[PDB]
Design a protein around this ligand. Sequence first.
Ligand SMILES: [Fe+3]
Length: 328
Amino acid sequence: VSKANVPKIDVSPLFGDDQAAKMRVAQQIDAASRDTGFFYAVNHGINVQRLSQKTKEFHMSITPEEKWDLAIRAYNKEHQDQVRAGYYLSIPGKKAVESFCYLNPNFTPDHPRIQAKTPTHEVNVWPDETKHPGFQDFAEQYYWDVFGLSSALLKGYALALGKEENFFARHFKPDDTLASVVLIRYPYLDPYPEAAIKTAADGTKLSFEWHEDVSLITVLYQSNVQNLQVETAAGYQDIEADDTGYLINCGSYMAHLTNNYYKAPIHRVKWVNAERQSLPFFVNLGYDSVIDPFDPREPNGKSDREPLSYGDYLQNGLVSLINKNGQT
Ligand SMILES: [Fe+3]
């Protein structure tokens, strides 16, 4: 198995006003997006040591009673309103991964999309503050820290495609973003449950099968354990780990709106028996956000693809991913 070319891109100019330096970043984003589809964003300004430490304290200290109390509807029939946000339980002996997902902290009972019961909008559920002191404060802060980094990255993608820098970012707003954070624990287990290991067509043992992401872009922190592979025409290639950068790739909404010029890379997660964290932020727009598709290869940029509203995309895509790759 060969190793993927995943460049490290200093994204700090995207936070500044040196326009030529931003264009040089945009060129590197373009190059990576047309190659394997992944790059590492470095010099991003996020305290990832604190993120990993606070996430570890939570996963290691939550008890079965609290997991049932936070569980999404797939694990607790009482929680019919929790399809996205809450706890995703492991099943001892059968399913190793567990996770906690949370949404826009601005989704409160006062929010009009919550009042209207619009699909994909939910109010977050949190553990008891006295059992997990500071966790909710940390997690909400982190949402806005990574929102800020993601907004800068979206300026880079816009410039890479020849658009003005707010072309995507204008639809990525704190009042309505459908973006989510997932705090995923992959545990060390001895013996490791065989039901939790999938065998790929090529014989590789996997924790999660091939998929394209349901996102505009995905902004991922992981601990320093190699696990991801990206598909190329010559087979799967290993993505090297780096626990000081964010790994970035496009989701299928970007592929739709660029007429596949920036593909959503197909990737999968190898089985590794090691305690590790995977903390994705899925950059989603608002429920009604629509971007007119365009084709960067054409002089006129004209595309015959239908505009697709982000909410309908996300509703359909999340369900499809569960059906194909399993309840997580
Ligand atoms: Fe993915």
